[PDB]
């Protein structure tokens, strides 16, 4: 076979899951967040996959 | 086989989950928050999948 | 078998789920939010699959 | 078979669930938000898939 | 078999799971948070994957 | 001060939630179920406060 | 101060939260529940107070 | 102070909760569940407070 | 102070949680459970509190 | 101070946390179960609190 790709790919078979990101979230997995209280300024409490370029 | 992908692409065969993304946000994972009380100013309390580029 | 794609394509055979996103926002999963208090100027309280890009 | 895509495609064959989308939002999921008091200037309370990109 | 990429690719075959990320968060895997207090102003509380890059 | 009950009392001051129950049920909290199928003969699904008496 | 019960009582001063039960079911906390897929006969699948007295 | 009590009581001063129970559930805690499959027959896939006493 | 008790009691001053129980199940602390799959016949899965006396 | 109790009492003062139980189950502490795969007949999988008296 061949494949050449300018990115980004994701080439595969016989293949359960697949993402693919350029960005930008993407959440596809179980995820329980049990919570009872959040304060303060300003505290990222429960952060799973995360990103934060601020400017 | 023979494939050329400028991207971004997701190519597969017998496959059970496919995302793909450029942005933006996807969601397609079971998910479940449970939560009693947010406060302060300002906190990411419960993020699961997440990206701020504030400029 | 052959293709020739310039993104974003999503391409596939036997497969139970497809997504493909350029934007913007899909949500395709189970989601449960239970909730008592939101305050806070301004906290994200429950954010899943989330993107800001504010200027 | 042959296939030439410009995107945003998505090709399939035996596939239960499909999502094309440039924009834009879908929603095509289970969704229960439950929810008690939403206060606070302005506190994204319960985001699912979200995309915020103010100028 | 040849292929030649520019990056970011994930190429194979026989495969479980797959991920492939410029960004940006990507969550597939099963997450459990149970948490009782947050506070202090401010700090990350739970924080599975996480980048922070503040300019 | 003097007090004295048969049961079931509940006697207070300054008491933001209460609840008496003699039976029977009560549902005061705040609740979200998000659900994608249910099959079986016959299983609970998702309970929160149950009993089951049957004779 | 004097106080005889005969049960079931709750008595207090200054008290954010009572409960007084017999039964029978009370539900007043927060609550999420996300779930995708229920089957098999007959499986308990998401219990929280739970009672289970056949007879 | 004087108290007779004969059961089952909860007696107390400047107290944030009070839970009593005979029976039967009571259910005021935060609590979040995420669950993506559950089969077999038949299996307690998430219990938290729980009893079980068939004859 | 005189206390006379025949049980099940709970007497105090000051204090921030009371459970009284008989029974019979109660569930006040925060509970996170995320889950991917459940099988098997059958198999108690995730069980926090719990009691099994069948006959 | 004198005190006759027959059990079971749980008498304090100066108190952050009281349980009292005769069962029974009580769960009031934080708990978190992230899980991926569960099988076999039967295995108890993740267990905290737990007593199986079958007859
Ligand atoms: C995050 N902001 C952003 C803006 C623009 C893009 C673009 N991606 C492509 C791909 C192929 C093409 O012919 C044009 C474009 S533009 C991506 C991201
Ligand atoms: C010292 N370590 C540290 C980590 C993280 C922070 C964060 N500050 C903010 C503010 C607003 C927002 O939406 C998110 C975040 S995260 C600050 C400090
Ligand atoms: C070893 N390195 C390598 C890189 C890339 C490939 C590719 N195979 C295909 C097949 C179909 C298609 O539309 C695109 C591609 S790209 C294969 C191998
Ligand atoms: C952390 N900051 C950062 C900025 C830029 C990069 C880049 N990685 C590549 C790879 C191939 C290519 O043709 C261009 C680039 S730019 C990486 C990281
Ligand atoms: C984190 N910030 C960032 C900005 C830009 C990138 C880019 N990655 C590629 C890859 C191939 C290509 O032809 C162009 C680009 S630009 C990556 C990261
Ligand atoms: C994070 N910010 C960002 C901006 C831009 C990109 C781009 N990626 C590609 C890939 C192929 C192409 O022909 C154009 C572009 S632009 C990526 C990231
Ligand atoms: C030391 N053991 C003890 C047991 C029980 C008590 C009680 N005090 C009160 C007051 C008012 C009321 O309606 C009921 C009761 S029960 C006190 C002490
Ligand atoms: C679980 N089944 C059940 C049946 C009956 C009871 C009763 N509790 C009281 C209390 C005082 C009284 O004068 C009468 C009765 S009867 C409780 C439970
Ligand atoms: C060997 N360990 C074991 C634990 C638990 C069980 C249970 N069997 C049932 C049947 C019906 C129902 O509603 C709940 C349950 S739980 C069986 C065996
Ligand atoms: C496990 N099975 C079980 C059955 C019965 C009990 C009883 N405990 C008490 C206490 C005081 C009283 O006057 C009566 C009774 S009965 C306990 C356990
Ligand atoms: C679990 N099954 C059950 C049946 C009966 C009870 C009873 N508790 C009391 C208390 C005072 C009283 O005068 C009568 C009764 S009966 C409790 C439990
Ligand atoms: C588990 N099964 C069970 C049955 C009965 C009980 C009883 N507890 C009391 C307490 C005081 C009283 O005057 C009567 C009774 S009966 C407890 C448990």
Do not use: L, R
Not at 4 to 16: C, F, N, P, Q, S
Not at 26 to 43: R, W
């Amino acid at each position: 076979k061949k494949g050449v790709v300018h990115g980004v790919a994701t080439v595969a078979e016989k293949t359960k899951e697949q993402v693919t990101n350029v960005g930008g979230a993407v959440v596809t997995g179980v995820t329980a967040v049990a919570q009872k209280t959040v304060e303060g300024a300003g505290s990222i409490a429960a952060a799973t996959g995360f990103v934060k370029k601020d400017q």
